[PDB]
Amino acid sequence: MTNIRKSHPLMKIINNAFIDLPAPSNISSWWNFGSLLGICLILQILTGLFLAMHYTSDTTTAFSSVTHICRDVNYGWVIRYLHANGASMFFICLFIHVGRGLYYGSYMFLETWNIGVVLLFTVMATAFMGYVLPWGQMSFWGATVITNLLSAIPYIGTDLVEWIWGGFSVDKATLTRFFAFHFILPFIITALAAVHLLFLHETGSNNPTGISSDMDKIPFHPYYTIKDILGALFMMLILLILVLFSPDLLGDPDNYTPANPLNTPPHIKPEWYFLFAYAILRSIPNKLGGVLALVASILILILMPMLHTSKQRSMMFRPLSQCLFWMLVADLITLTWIGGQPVEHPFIIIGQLASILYFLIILVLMPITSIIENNLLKW
Amino acid sequence: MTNIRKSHPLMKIINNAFIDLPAPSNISSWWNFGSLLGICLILQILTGLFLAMHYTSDTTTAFSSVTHICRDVNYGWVIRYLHANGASMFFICLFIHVGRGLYYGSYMFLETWNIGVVLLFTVMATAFMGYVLPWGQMSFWGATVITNLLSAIPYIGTDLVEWIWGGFSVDKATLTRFFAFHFILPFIITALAAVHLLFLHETGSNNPTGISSDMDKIPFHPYYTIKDILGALFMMLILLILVLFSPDLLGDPDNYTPANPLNTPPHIKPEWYFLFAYAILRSIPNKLGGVLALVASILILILMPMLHTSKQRSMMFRPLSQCLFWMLVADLITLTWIGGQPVEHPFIIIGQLASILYFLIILVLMPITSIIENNLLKW
Amino acid sequence: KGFSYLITATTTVGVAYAAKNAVSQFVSSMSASADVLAMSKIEIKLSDIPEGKNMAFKWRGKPLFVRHRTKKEIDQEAAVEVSQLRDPQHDLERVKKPEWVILIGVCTHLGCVPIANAGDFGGYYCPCHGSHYDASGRIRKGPAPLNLEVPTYEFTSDDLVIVG
Amino acid sequence: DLELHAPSYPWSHRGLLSSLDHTSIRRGFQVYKQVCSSCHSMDYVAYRHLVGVCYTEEEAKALAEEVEVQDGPNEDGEMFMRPGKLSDYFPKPYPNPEAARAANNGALPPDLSYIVRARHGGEDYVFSLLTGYCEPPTGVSLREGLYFNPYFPGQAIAMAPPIYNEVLEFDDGTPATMSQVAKDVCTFLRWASEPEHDHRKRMGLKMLMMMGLLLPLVYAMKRHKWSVLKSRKLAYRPP
Amino acid sequence: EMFMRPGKLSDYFPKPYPNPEAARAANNGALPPDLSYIVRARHGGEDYVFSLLT
Amino acid sequence: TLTARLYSLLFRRTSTFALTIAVGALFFERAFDQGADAIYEHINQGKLWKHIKHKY
Amino acid sequence: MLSRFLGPRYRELARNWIPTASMWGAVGAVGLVWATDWRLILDWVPYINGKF
Amino acid sequence: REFGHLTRMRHVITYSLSPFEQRAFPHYFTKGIPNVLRRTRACILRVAPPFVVFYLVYTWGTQEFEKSKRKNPA
Ligand code: HEC
Ligand code: HEM
Ligand code: HEM
Ligand code: HEM
Ligand code: HEM
Ligand code: FES
């Protein structure tokens, strides 16, 4: 006789995944966000399904269908705002997870780090694409701007924007193809998340100290289930606070207007989780260089495993690196704020300077600070 | 240092699932229908996505959207008819696969068999959902009849039909929810197919003789990859002939008429792969009895491992049982033809006898015949 | 070995041809459909449009004015400076052939349609919030932020002028 | 009761790799626009589709220019007349279904964009229905204003006889024989519900030859790789 | 023919102008925005619209 | 044997094997397209649109 | 890294693998031109420019 | 279930030849045709009857439907 928990194949996989998987005891709350992301994935996908059950992707019905969901459908407004604020919370958790990975040297798990970068790319694409679906003024106009950014690509680039648009500009074909891709992509995210978990489970998670915790490992089920339950409950507390008291808080009011291609909005801006890289795009004058900087602003995460030079993996014992990391976080907040604001004086200079400081901190200040760090500790 | 094929995490799974998996040396072509099914998934999923990028689910414009796909999109008709006939071939290959499993005694693998039954239910519901989407006369009316079939459930029955069917009649909400479920389900089918292979692998495979083939296992990659490639190319032959010479061979022409709730078509039949149950529905006069018999027609598969009385797993050395199995197949084609025909004097009695003979073979004739052969073989 | 691998080579080239002739089908399927090609990007205009007129047509998704700018209004547009314009755009880059002006029909302030032969300067006037426009296609001043958009029209065979 | 199954006519396109007669397609569009268009609609098939299959570009431009189609809001918001173009769809009879039903006794003339692909029989059924009007036999006297068509389900159709001999003058010079007119319009409808027939049979040819090459070669590769297994001389030498 | 009947609970709110171009041509060329989502579309909400009216 | 020269030159290296396959595709696509189109027009002479534009 | 790849035998490996990698590059370029039907290149080659 | 914990076997010798030395179709027709004929002879005796009785049932049902749908003299 043998345990069904660790002899049945599905149950054996689940057991080795999150029942009897050894875990560091000193894991802080910063790791809970990982599970939160998974929760914020499922809570998204399910809701999306219900939205897809009352959404008719067409330039003559998209806004009307969304309105019909909001008003007429029994408890449809709650699903819609749940979806929007859940995407926002998903990006909050994603950014916090990336910050944790940077802080505690979690990028030493190279395969997991690269798979996470791919997941992050896919999530940005999914959210950008999904924001088109309500077909508001902001949706259509922002989509036009972002897709037209691909015209800067040399040679083929112009043809590409005709290919993505499904024609001469963003129209019904673009809307329906965006709907289809928005449907398919989250399942690719789920598969990539499974692969990301496999890679991490091969080596095990990293404690805040950075030292290997093989000597002190605790089973996952008795402890790190209820802790993740508490984390998910707190995330739900925040998310339903947003949905039930300030539904259209982060979303721009201009979306609640039929997409009229005869009137440019006063300011065309993406989501708050998109304004930082869009501000980076704004900063560079050259169009092609702008797109290169925009893509590099996220692709630079892959370079992080190579740029690490300090002998300590984590940052608990590197105060100078901690100050640099917080300078980077403040710089990202400045990028978001600048992206919100129009490209005028002095926002132009502030955005440019913060854009340079972003790459300068990531590529230069952190490694040089790490060299000084090693020199300061006899090694 | 070490081979990446058997050391990399994902590559290890791929290696021991498809490259170096020890497969029986003498599996016939009938086993190849496994791989085709998976291919018939991917080949049909990729097409299915491309229709989702030109198909608006609104009832007032679903049929016009389908006509626009077939008439305006570059090579749209190829995708549309490839999708339809790929679903038809998926059901052909599914029936052949179930016939193989029942024949060569593979249904003794338990977990894989039940998972296969669940997969059959999922895809068989998915095709029914997909047929409604074009919103033709047969699509709408067959959906009406099949959904109203559920009203025979006692007490809560109508309420369930009030819920699944959107109340009212098959109308705007029904089309959207059918599209959403049609989209979500095949990914569940993919996950369940992965679980199906996972349950299959630790048992190996059932060779035609039914004896354990642990003394003749051969690597998968050199031989069975090219064998399944040739099989998939033959399935390409049949699918392309169907798609490219007689696109609407396995289809009702009245589906090319926009759905009208004000006119019942002279004949109300589902697709060809559903009639084998539809006729069973007409066999029992009672509505609830019809529901139970129609469900049991597929539920009887999980009872097959219990109803195995022969001492030999396989069917090659059981001629009397072979005659019974081929009688079962002939009864299946007879049931399909009867479901095709309307309900008059020549067809009612034939359908009743066919359903009775179906059940009598599966639960009665086959075990008794197996016992007779066991006695006739001195064991 | 040569024969055994020639079999494989011929199989592979056939499979490559099939793979291209399928993936190209799919890629062109996601590309622009025939309806948008044959409804939107075809704007032949006959020279029936006489001097000093603005018969406007709703193409793509916006109207467009085909101005037959006569010699008089041409020399007013020439005389009007460039520098104090809100977004300086000289008539040269505004329009290729002086006799005909091609420009969109949606005022950039909030939309609507500018009525022609009005707006103090003479050319255009959007009455929604009273924005007068420069006759050459620009704006001299007013509530509207920037000048009227000019499409990628082509002047080939002046009798039959196509707009892209 | 009963029903006539339409006899299998020897259509030029009935061949496995035989295409449509595009001249017949043009002459069948002419009859559609002359007599059929007065009461029937084709909706999806547009003037642009005719270019490159039955009519040249300028001929189709003139064809669309002949008819006046209704265009959107005027500068005052009035729903005004306008000459047709290639982008326009085939102009339709009486606007809403209710007017069409009221004008045509109490029957709605179905759209022909899919009528040859929506009826069991297709071209054979359509041709037989058109050239099958017969005097009602004894004892089956139908309504007033009804017409006996044996091939029509119910044997009682609401058509004034559509095609009678010498109704339309073909531009090419073909005689106005009722059979000629019916065959031409039937071919036009087959093109209408299958606007890929030529290219579909072209793909059929290409796929047939491609895999007539591919199957022997892939099979040869399979036998080449499997040949080790299919020639394993086994042995058994117990001590 | 399009017949006129007394409105019922099923009907939505009446639209004063038949088509938008008629509305623009009627007033001055400007389009009165749809009042359904007007409050949720303008930065400021009700405090905006009220401030406008007064 | 000519096959021996083929294996010695174009087939020994898998990379030049890929080059041979690619150039074979280059020529074979055009050859197959031209031949199949010629056969198609030969079967349906005086029926396709290509065989009738001469009048118009 | 930088110095550990900067050796004599490493440049020997580079010289050995220059032909195969270089003409793999030609394989890729020809495949790209083929797949995209690049008229800029395909026009010059004979017997294929007829397709245009 | 990977190679090695499969079974225990003793005194078994397997001779195999390179795929580049055997013809891919050794006596394709002259040997395949008798084998296919033998397989057909073995299987048809139990395969054909259930399918042929379906054919008589189908023909009987079709003619029964057409004769019952016809009018009777009365
Ligand atoms: C002046 C009137 C009129 C003309 C001319 C006319 N039709 Fe009709 N047609 C009708 C009406 C009314 C019906 C509806 C009858 C019914 O319910 O089937 C109809 C029905 C049909 C149907 C449906 C038959 C079915 O199976 O239900 C077809 C096909 C058809 N017409 C084809 C044609 C063709 C082809 C032509 C000329 C080349 C033509 N018609 C000319 C009025 C007309
Ligand atoms: C990866 C998780 C997902 C993210 C980040 C995401 C993101 C978004 C966003 C930002 C919107 C726009 C919300 C708004 O209108 O303000 C949206 C809309 C939509 N999404 Fe998703 N989505 C996700 C998953 C899904 C899934 C799995 C489906 C399909 C089942 C789906 C279907 C829809 C639909 C139908 C809409 C339009 C309704 C609406 O805009 O409110 N989403 N999505
Ligand atoms: C789709 C969203 C994501 C999901 C569902 C996900 C899932 C998880 C989970 C559950 C963990 C374990 C808990 C934890 O360590 O936080 C984890 C760890 C990790 N993830 Fe992610 N992740 C996602 C996105 C990312 C991103 C964007 C990155 C960065 C590129 C990333 C890199 C990592 C790293 C480095 C670890 C290890 C952290 C450690 O061991 O301390 N992940 N992931
Ligand atoms: C279990 C696998 C599936 C089967 C058997 C299936 C089957 C079908 C069938 C038979 C139709 C009707 C086609 C017609 O009447 O011409 C249909 C419609 C449709 N299916 Fe699926 N489907 C499947 C999965 C999917 C997936 C994964 C997608 C999206 C990626 C999809 C998208 C559609 C769409 C958009 C339609 C409407 C357009 C059309 O009718 O062709 N289906 N499906
Ligand atoms: C979604 C469709 C399905 C897929 C993709 C699938 C996939 C596979 C594959 C690839 C195999 C190995 C090849 C083979 O032995 O045939 C297999 C084996 C098997 N499948 Fe399925 N299957 C499907 C549906 C089913 C169904 C409906 C059943 C029956 C309830 C079933 C039961 C089995 C059994 C019993 C085996 C073992 C065959 C043997 O080893 O003899 N599967 N499946
Ligand atoms: S929209 Fe033209 S003036 Fe305001």
PDB file of C-alpha atoms in Angstrom, chain A residues 107-228:
ATOM      1  CA  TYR A 107      17.439  36.398 -11.181  1.00  0.00           C
ATOM      2  CA  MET A 108      20.192  33.873 -10.395  1.00  0.00           C
ATOM      3  CA  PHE A 109      17.515  31.366 -11.449  1.00  0.00           C
ATOM      4  CA  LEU A 110      18.220  32.202 -15.071  1.00  0.00           C
ATOM      5  CA  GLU A 111      15.631  29.951 -16.717  1.00  0.00           C
ATOM      6  CA  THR A 112      12.838  31.061 -14.387  1.00  0.00           C
ATOM      7  CA  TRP A 113      13.884  34.686 -14.874  1.00  0.00           C
ATOM      8  CA  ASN A 114      13.742  34.456 -18.672  1.00  0.00           C
ATOM      9  CA  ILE A 115      10.388  32.658 -18.585  1.00  0.00           C
ATOM     10  CA  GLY A 116       9.150  35.401 -16.269  1.00  0.00           C
ATOM     11  CA  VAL A 117      10.273  38.053 -18.746  1.00  0.00           C
ATOM     12  CA  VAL A 118       8.349  36.235 -21.482  1.00  0.00           C
ATOM     13  CA  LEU A 119       5.288  36.083 -19.219  1.00  0.00           C
ATOM     14  CA  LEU A 120       5.608  39.807 -18.508  1.00  0.00           C
ATOM     15  CA  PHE A 121       5.775  40.571 -22.243  1.00  0.00           C
ATOM     16  CA  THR A 122       2.700  38.440 -22.879  1.00  0.00           C
ATOM     17  CA  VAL A 123       0.803  40.159 -20.061  1.00  0.00           C
ATOM     18  CA  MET A 124       1.573  43.626 -21.428  1.00  0.00           C
ATOM     19  CA  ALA A 125       0.432  42.527 -24.885  1.00  0.00           C
ATOM     20  CA  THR A 126      -2.755  41.012 -23.449  1.00  0.00           C
ATOM     21  CA  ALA A 127      -3.641  44.141 -21.479  1.00  0.00           C
ATOM     22  CA  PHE A 128      -2.872  46.536 -24.350  1.00  0.00           C
ATOM     23  CA  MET A 129      -4.991  44.399 -26.653  1.00  0.00           C
ATOM     24  CA  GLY A 130      -7.828  44.022 -24.146  1.00  0.00           C
ATOM     25  CA  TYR A 131      -8.140  47.742 -23.473  1.00  0.00           C
ATOM     26  CA  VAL A 132      -9.250  48.084 -27.111  1.00  0.00           C
ATOM     27  CA  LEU A 133     -12.273  45.820 -26.630  1.00  0.00           C
ATOM     28  CA  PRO A 134     -14.677  48.374 -25.034  1.00  0.00           C
ATOM     29  CA  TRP A 135     -14.028  50.529 -28.137  1.00  0.00           C
ATOM     30  CA  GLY A 136     -14.147  53.856 -26.342  1.00  0.00           C
ATOM     31  CA  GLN A 137     -12.528  57.047 -27.559  1.00  0.00           C
ATOM     32  CA  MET A 138      -9.382  56.356 -25.536  1.00  0.00           C
ATOM     33  CA  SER A 139      -9.318  52.693 -26.595  1.00  0.00           C
ATOM     34  CA  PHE A 140      -9.407  53.388 -30.337  1.00  0.00           C
ATOM     35  CA  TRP A 141      -7.159  56.453 -30.270  1.00  0.00           C
ATOM     36  CA  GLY A 142      -4.509  54.920 -28.028  1.00  0.00           C
ATOM     37  CA  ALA A 143      -4.589  51.785 -30.165  1.00  0.00           C
ATOM     38  CA  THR A 144      -4.027  53.893 -33.275  1.00  0.00           C
ATOM     39  CA  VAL A 145      -1.031  55.604 -31.662  1.00  0.00           C
ATOM     40  CA  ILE A 146       0.565  52.436 -30.267  1.00  0.00           C
ATOM     41  CA  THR A 147       0.124  50.411 -33.454  1.00  0.00           C
ATOM     42  CA  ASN A 148       1.320  53.332 -35.593  1.00  0.00           C
ATOM     43  CA  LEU A 149       4.487  53.344 -33.482  1.00  0.00           C
ATOM     44  CA  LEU A 150       5.417  50.213 -35.460  1.00  0.00           C
ATOM     45  CA  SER A 151       5.594  52.348 -38.621  1.00  0.00           C
ATOM     46  CA  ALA A 152       8.976  53.598 -37.389  1.00  0.00           C
ATOM     47  CA  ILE A 153      10.451  50.131 -37.983  1.00  0.00           C
ATOM     48  CA  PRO A 154      12.600  50.315 -41.145  1.00  0.00           C
ATOM     49  CA  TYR A 155      11.531  48.737 -44.424  1.00  0.00           C
ATOM     50  CA  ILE A 156       8.782  46.255 -43.513  1.00  0.00           C
ATOM     51  CA  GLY A 157       7.521  48.350 -40.619  1.00  0.00           C
ATOM     52  CA  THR A 158       4.881  50.307 -42.521  1.00  0.00           C
ATOM     53  CA  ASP A 159       3.455  47.137 -44.072  1.00  0.00           C
ATOM     54  CA  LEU A 160       3.298  45.662 -40.570  1.00  0.00           C
ATOM     55  CA  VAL A 161       0.926  48.359 -39.352  1.00  0.00           C
ATOM     56  CA  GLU A 162      -1.285  47.570 -42.342  1.00  0.00           C
ATOM     57  CA  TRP A 163      -1.090  43.887 -41.412  1.00  0.00           C
ATOM     58  CA  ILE A 164      -1.919  44.375 -37.729  1.00  0.00           C
ATOM     59  CA  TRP A 165      -4.704  46.865 -38.471  1.00  0.00           C
ATOM     60  CA  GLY A 166      -6.227  44.452 -40.965  1.00  0.00           C
ATOM     61  CA  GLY A 167      -6.431  47.349 -43.408  1.00  0.00           C
ATOM     62  CA  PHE A 168      -5.630  51.054 -43.634  1.00  0.00           C
ATOM     63  CA  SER A 169      -6.279  51.879 -39.957  1.00  0.00           C
ATOM     64  CA  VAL A 170      -7.767  50.498 -36.743  1.00  0.00           C
ATOM     65  CA  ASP A 171     -11.256  49.308 -37.702  1.00  0.00           C
ATOM     66  CA  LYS A 172     -13.657  46.434 -37.034  1.00  0.00           C
ATOM     67  CA  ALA A 173     -11.177  43.828 -38.285  1.00  0.00           C
ATOM     68  CA  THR A 174      -8.623  45.072 -35.761  1.00  0.00           C
ATOM     69  CA  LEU A 175     -11.268  44.939 -33.024  1.00  0.00           C
ATOM     70  CA  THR A 176     -12.286  41.342 -33.711  1.00  0.00           C
ATOM     71  CA  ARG A 177      -8.717  40.093 -34.151  1.00  0.00           C
ATOM     72  CA  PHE A 178      -7.810  41.835 -30.892  1.00  0.00           C
ATOM     73  CA  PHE A 179     -10.742  40.048 -29.251  1.00  0.00           C
ATOM     74  CA  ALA A 180      -9.604  36.654 -30.556  1.00  0.00           C
ATOM     75  CA  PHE A 181      -5.983  37.187 -29.527  1.00  0.00           C
ATOM     76  CA  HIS A 182      -7.108  38.523 -26.133  1.00  0.00           C
ATOM     77  CA  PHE A 183      -9.044  35.295 -25.712  1.00  0.00           C
ATOM     78  CA  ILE A 184      -6.198  32.961 -26.663  1.00  0.00           C
ATOM     79  CA  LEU A 185      -3.260  34.697 -24.940  1.00  0.00           C
ATOM     80  CA  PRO A 186      -4.129  34.108 -21.231  1.00  0.00           C
ATOM     81  CA  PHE A 187      -4.006  30.340 -21.758  1.00  0.00           C
ATOM     82  CA  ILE A 188      -0.525  30.758 -23.221  1.00  0.00           C
ATOM     83  CA  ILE A 189       0.193  32.736 -20.045  1.00  0.00           C
ATOM     84  CA  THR A 190      -1.087  29.787 -18.005  1.00  0.00           C
ATOM     85  CA  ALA A 191       1.168  27.329 -19.845  1.00  0.00           C
ATOM     86  CA  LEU A 192       4.156  29.657 -19.488  1.00  0.00           C
ATOM     87  CA  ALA A 193       3.370  30.030 -15.781  1.00  0.00           C
ATOM     88  CA  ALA A 194       3.366  26.244 -15.432  1.00  0.00           C
ATOM     89  CA  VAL A 195       6.782  26.117 -17.118  1.00  0.00           C
ATOM     90  CA  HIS A 196       8.006  28.968 -14.897  1.00  0.00           C
ATOM     91  CA  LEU A 197       6.881  27.053 -11.817  1.00  0.00           C
ATOM     92  CA  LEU A 198       8.592  23.889 -13.085  1.00  0.00           C
ATOM     93  CA  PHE A 199      11.915  25.691 -13.518  1.00  0.00           C
ATOM     94  CA  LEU A 200      11.674  27.248 -10.054  1.00  0.00           C
ATOM     95  CA  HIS A 201      10.611  23.961  -8.431  1.00  0.00           C
ATOM     96  CA  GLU A 202      13.701  22.271  -9.861  1.00  0.00           C
ATOM     97  CA  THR A 203      16.011  24.458  -7.755  1.00  0.00           C
ATOM     98  CA  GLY A 204      13.737  25.838  -5.037  1.00  0.00           C
ATOM     99  CA  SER A 205      12.886  29.372  -4.018  1.00  0.00           C
ATOM    100  CA  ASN A 206      15.354  31.913  -2.648  1.00  0.00           C
ATOM    101  CA  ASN A 207      15.135  33.303   0.883  1.00  0.00           C
ATOM    102  CA  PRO A 208      15.603  37.041   1.560  1.00  0.00           C
ATOM    103  CA  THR A 209      19.104  36.425   2.942  1.00  0.00           C
ATOM    104  CA  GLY A 210      20.335  34.859  -0.298  1.00  0.00           C
ATOM    105  CA  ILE A 211      22.096  32.016   1.507  1.00  0.00           C
ATOM    106  CA  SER A 212      20.957  28.514   0.607  1.00  0.00           C
ATOM    107  CA  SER A 213      18.208  27.378   2.978  1.00  0.00           C
ATOM    108  CA  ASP A 214      18.593  23.637   2.340  1.00  0.00           C
ATOM    109  CA  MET A 215      19.342  23.022   6.025  1.00  0.00           C
ATOM    110  CA  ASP A 216      16.107  24.721   7.134  1.00  0.00           C
ATOM    111  CA  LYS A 217      13.241  23.713   4.853  1.00  0.00           C
ATOM    112  CA  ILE A 218       9.603  23.357   5.886  1.00  0.00           C
ATOM    113  CA  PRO A 219       6.784  21.515   4.066  1.00  0.00           C
ATOM    114  CA  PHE A 220       4.663  23.723   1.846  1.00  0.00           C
ATOM    115  CA  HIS A 221       1.173  22.457   2.689  1.00  0.00           C
ATOM    116  CA  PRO A 222       0.945  23.032   6.479  1.00  0.00           C
ATOM    117  CA  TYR A 223       2.302  26.595   6.339  1.00  0.00           C
ATOM    118  CA  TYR A 224       2.588  28.218   2.908  1.00  0.00           C
ATOM    119  CA  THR A 225      -1.005  27.464   1.964  1.00  0.00           C
ATOM    120  CA  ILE A 226      -2.763  29.489   4.674  1.00  0.00           C
ATOM    121  CA  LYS A 227      -0.213  32.305   4.345  1.00  0.00           C
ATOM    122  CA  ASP A 228      -0.992  32.505   0.631  1.00  0.00           C
TER     123      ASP A 228
END
